[PDB]
Coordinates of C-alpha atoms and ligand atoms in Angstrom, one line a residue:
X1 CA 0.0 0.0 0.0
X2 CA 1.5 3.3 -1.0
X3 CA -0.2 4.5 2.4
X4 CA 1.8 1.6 4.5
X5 CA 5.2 2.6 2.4
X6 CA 4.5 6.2 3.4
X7 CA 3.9 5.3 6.8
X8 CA 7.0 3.4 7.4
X9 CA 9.2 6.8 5.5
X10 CA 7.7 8.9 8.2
X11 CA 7.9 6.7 10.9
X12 CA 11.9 5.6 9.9
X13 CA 12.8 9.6 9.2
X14 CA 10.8 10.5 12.6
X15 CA 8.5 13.3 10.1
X16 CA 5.2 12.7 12.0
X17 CA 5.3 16.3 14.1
X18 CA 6.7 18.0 10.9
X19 CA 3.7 16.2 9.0
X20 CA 0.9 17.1 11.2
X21 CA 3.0 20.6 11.4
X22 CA 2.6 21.0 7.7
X23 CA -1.1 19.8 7.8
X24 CA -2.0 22.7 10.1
X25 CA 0.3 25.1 8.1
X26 CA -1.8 24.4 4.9
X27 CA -5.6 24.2 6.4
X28 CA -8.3 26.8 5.9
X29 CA -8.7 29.6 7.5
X30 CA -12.5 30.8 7.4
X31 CA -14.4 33.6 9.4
X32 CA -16.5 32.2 12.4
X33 CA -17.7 35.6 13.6
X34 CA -21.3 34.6 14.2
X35 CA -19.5 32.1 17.3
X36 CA -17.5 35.4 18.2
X37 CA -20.6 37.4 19.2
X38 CA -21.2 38.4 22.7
X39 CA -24.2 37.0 23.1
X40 CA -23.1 33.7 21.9
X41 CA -19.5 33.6 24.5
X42 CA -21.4 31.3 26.8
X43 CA -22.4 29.2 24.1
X44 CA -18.7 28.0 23.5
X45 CA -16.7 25.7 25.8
X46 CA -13.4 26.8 24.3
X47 CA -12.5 30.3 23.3
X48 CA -10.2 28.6 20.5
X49 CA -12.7 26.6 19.1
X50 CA -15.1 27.9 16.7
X51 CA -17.3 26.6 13.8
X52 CA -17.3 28.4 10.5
X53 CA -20.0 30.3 9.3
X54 CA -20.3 28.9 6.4
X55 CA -20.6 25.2 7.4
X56 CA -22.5 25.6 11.2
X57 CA -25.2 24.2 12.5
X58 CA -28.4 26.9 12.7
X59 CA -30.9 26.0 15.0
X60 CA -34.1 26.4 13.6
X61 CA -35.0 28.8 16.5
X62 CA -35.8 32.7 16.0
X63 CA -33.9 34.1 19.0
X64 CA -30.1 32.9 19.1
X65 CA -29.2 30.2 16.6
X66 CA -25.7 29.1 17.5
X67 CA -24.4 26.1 18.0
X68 CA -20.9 25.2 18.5
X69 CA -21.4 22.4 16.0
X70 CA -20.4 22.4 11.9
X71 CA -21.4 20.7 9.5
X72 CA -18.4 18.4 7.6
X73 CA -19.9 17.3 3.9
X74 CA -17.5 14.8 2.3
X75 CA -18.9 15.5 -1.2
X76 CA -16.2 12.5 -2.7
X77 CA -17.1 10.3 0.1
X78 CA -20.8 11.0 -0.2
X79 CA -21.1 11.0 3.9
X80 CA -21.6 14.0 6.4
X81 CA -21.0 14.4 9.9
X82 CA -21.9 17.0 12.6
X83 CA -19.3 17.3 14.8
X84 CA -19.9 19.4 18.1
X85 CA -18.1 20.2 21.3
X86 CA -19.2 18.0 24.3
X87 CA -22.5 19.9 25.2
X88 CA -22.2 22.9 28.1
X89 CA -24.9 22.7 31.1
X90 CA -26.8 25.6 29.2
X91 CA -26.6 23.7 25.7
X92 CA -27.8 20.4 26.6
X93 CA -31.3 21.9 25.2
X94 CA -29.8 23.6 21.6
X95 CA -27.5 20.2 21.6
X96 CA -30.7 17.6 21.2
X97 CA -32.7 20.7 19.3
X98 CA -30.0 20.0 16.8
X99 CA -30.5 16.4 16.8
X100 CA -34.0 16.7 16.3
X101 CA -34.0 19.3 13.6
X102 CA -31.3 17.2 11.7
X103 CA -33.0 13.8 11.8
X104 CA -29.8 12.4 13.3
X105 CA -30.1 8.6 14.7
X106 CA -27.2 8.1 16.2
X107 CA -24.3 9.9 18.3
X108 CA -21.1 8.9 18.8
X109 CA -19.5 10.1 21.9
X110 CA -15.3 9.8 22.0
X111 CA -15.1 11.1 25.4
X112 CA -15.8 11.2 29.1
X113 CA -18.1 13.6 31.0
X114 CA -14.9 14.0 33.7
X115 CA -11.5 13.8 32.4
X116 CA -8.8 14.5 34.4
X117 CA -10.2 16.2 37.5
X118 CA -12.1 18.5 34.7
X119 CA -15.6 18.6 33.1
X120 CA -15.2 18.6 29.7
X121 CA -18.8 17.5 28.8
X122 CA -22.1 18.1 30.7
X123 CA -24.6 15.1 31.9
X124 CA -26.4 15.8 29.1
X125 CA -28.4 12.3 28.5
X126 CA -29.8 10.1 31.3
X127 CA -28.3 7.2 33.2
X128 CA -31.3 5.7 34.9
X129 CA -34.5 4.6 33.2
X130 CA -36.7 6.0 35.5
X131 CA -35.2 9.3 35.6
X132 CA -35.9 11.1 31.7
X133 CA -34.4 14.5 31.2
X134 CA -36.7 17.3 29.8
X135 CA -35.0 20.4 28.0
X136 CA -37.7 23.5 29.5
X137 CA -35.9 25.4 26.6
X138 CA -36.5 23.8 23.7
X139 CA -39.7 21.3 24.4
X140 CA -37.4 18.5 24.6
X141 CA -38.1 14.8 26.6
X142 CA -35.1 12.2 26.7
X143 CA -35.2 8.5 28.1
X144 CA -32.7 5.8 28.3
X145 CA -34.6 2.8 27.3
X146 CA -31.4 0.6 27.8
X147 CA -27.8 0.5 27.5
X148 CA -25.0 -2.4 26.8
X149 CA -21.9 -1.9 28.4
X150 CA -18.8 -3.2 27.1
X151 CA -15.5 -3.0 28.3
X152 CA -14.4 0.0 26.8
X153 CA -17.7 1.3 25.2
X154 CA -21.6 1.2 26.0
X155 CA -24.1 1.9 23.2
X156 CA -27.4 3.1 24.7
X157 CA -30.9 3.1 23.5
X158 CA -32.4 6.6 23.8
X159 CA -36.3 8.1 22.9
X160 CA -35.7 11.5 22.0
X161 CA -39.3 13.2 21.8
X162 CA -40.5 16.4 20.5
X163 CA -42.9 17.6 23.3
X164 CA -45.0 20.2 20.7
X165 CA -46.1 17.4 18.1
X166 CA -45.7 14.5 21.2
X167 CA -43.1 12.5 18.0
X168 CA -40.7 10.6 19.4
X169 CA -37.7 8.8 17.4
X170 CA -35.0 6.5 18.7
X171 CA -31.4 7.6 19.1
X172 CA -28.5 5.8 19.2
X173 CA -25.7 6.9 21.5
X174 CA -22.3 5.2 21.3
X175 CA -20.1 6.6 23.8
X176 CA -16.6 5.1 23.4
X177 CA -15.0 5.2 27.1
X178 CA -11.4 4.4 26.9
X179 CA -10.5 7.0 24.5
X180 CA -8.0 9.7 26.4
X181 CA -8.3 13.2 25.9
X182 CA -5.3 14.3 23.3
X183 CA -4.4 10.7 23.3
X184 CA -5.6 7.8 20.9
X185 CA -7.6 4.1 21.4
X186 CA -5.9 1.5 22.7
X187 CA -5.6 -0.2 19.3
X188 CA -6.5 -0.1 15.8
X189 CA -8.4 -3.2 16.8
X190 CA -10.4 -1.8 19.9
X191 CA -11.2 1.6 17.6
X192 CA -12.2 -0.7 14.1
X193 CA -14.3 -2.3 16.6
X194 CA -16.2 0.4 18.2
X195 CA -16.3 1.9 14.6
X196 CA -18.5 -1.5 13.0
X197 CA -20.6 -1.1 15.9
X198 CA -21.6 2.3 15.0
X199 CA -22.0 1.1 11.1
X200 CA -23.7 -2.0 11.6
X201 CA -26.4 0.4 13.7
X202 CA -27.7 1.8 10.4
X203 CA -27.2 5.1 11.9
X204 CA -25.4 6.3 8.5
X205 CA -27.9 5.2 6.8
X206 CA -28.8 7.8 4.2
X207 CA -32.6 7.8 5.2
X208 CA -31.3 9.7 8.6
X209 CA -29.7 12.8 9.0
X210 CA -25.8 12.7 9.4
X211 CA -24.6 11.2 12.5
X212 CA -23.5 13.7 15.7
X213 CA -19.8 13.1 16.8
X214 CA -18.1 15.2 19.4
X215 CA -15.7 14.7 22.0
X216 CA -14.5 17.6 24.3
X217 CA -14.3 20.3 22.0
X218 CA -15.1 18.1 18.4
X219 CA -12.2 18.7 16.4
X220 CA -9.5 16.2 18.4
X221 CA -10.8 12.9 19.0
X222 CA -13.5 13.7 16.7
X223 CA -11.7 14.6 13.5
X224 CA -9.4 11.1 14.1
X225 CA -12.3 9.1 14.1
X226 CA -13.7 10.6 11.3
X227 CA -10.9 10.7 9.1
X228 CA -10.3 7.4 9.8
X229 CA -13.8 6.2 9.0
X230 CA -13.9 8.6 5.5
X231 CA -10.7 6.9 4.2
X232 CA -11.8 3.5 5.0
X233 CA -15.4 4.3 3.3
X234 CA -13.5 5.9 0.4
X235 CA -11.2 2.7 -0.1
X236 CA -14.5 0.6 0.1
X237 CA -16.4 2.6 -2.5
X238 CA -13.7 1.9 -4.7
X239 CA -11.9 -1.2 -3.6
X240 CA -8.5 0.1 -4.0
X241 CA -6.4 1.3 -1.1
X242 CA -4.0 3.1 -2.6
X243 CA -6.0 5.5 -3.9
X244 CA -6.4 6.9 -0.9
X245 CA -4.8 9.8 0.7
X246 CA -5.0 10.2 3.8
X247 CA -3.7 13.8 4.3
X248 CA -5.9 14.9 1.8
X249 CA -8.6 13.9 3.3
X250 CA -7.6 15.6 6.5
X251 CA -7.3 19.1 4.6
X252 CA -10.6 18.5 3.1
X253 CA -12.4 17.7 6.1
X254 CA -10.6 21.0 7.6
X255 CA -12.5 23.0 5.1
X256 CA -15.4 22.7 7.4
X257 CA -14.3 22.9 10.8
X258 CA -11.0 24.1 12.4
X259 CA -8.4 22.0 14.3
X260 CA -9.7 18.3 13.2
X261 CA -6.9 16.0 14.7
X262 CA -4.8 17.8 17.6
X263 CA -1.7 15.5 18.1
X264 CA 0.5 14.0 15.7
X265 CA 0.1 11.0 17.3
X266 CA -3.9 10.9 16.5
X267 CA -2.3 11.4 13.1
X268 CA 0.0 8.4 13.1
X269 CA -3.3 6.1 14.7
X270 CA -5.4 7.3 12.1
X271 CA -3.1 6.0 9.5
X272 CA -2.4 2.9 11.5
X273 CA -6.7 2.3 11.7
X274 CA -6.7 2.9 8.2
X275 CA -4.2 0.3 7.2
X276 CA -5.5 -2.1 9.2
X277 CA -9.6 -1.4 8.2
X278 CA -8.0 -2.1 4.4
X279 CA -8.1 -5.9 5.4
X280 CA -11.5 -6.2 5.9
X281 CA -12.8 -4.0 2.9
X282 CA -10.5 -6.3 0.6
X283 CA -11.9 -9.6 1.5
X284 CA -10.7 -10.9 4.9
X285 CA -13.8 -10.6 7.2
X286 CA -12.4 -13.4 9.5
X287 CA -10.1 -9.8 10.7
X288 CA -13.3 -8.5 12.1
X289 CA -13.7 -11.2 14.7
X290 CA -10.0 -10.8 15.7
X291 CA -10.5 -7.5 16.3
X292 CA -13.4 -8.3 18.5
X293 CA -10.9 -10.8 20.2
X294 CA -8.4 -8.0 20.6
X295 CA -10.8 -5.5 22.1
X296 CA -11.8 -7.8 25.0
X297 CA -14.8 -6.4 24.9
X298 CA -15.9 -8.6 28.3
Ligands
OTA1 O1 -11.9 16.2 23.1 C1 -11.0 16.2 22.2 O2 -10.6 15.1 21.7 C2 -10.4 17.6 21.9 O3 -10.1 17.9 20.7 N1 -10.2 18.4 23.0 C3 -9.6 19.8 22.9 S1 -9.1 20.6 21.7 C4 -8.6 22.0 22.4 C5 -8.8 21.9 23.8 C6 -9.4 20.5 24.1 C7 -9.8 20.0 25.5 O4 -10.6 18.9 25.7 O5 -9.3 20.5 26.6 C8 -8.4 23.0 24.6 C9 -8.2 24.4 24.0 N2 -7.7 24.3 22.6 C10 -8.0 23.2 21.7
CL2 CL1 -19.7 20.9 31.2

């Protein structure tokens, strides 16, 4: 693969920070003055994280519309994405309004409400059956109806429902535990995993809106799983891995929202994930159960 021979030049030469370097040298640089308002400072969990204008999230409300959420359309790929920072105690409402108003089914989740002594996401879906969350704000109602816990990941059943019209849908919340904060998954295995859990869902189905991933802020843990799952959906639509690139992809995707990837590490993973998600698109599906094995998901 000219994406493994790559790999091993940067790895051998010790390139990866001047790679990523030259990654966030070249990516776009577009206004995001509607996030910079006043009234929208509380609205933002970090002061250097912004979404564009021209690819956010409006809420279909009349008084404020921001949300700290943008809106990546892989035109090549033929997939979107959302990705969002981890909800503020004030956003929970806007947060789910967007869910709603973009017919999303599922949300993936890369991070945990507490992370090193810090919050870096509120509460902002319920852990007990009994107990359902209702957003006064924006005529929200939010239940768990169940939840599987694995090892390193749960994937929980949700009914969001839309208290004006009393329509409810199902959501689908995968909320990958194990996945430090400017740090990357344990293994390609444990994240290719996690990642055909999400697919298998039908959440990216094209009959739903595009799927709603954030981690802390949505550009770090968020942009390497999505790179990730773009190149290997790429690769699949054309069943031909070198075709692929990888940094490319990453500059594309940076079109629509700053930041996407934070370490060079999370850029050396992402290749790694790629590489090894080539095995199963070409023909080896036996690769999937090893990576279930590998996971130890129990
Ligand atoms: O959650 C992630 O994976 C992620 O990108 N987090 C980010 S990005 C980012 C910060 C954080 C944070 O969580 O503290 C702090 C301020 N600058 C950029
Ligand atoms: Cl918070």
């Amino acid at each position: 693969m000219e994406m493994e021979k790559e790999f091993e030049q940067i790895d051998k030469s010790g390139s990866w920070a001047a790679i990523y370097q030259d990654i966030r040298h070249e990516a776009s640089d577009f206004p995001c003055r509607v996030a910079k308002l006043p009234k929208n400072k509380n609205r933002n969990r970090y002061r250097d994280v912004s979404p564009f204008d021209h690819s956010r999230i409006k809420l279909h409300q009349e008084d404020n519309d921001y949300i700290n959420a943008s809106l990546i359309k892989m035109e090549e790929a033929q997939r979107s994405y959302i990705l969002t920072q981890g909800p503020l105690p004030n956003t929970c409402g806007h947060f789910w309004e967007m869910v709603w108003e973009q017919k999303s089914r599922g949300v993936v989740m890369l991070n945990r409400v507490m992370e090193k002594g810090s919050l870096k996401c509120a509460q902002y879906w319920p852990q007990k059956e009994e107990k359902e969350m209702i957003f006064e704000d924006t005529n929200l109602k939010l239940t768990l109806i169940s939840e599987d816990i694995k090892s390193y990941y749960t994937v929980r059943q949700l009914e969001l429902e839309n208290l004006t019209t009393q329509e409810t849908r199902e959501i689908l919340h995968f909320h990958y535990t194990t996945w430090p904060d400017f740090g990357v998954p344990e293994s390609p295995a444990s994240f290719l995993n996690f990642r055909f859990k999400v697919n298998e869902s039908g959440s990216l189905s094209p009959e739903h809106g595009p799927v709603v991933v954030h981690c802390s802020a949505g550009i770090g843990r968020s942009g390497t799983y999505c790179l990730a799952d773009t190149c290997l959906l790429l690769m699949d639509k054309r069943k031909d891995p070198s075709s692929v690139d990888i940094k490319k992809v990453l500059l594309e995707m940076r079109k629509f929202r700053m930041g996407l990837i934070q370490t060079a590490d999370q850029l050396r993973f992402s290749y790694l994930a790629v590489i090894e998600g080539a095995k199963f698109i070409m023909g080896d599906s036996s690769v999937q159960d090893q990576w279930k094995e590998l996971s130890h998901e129990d």
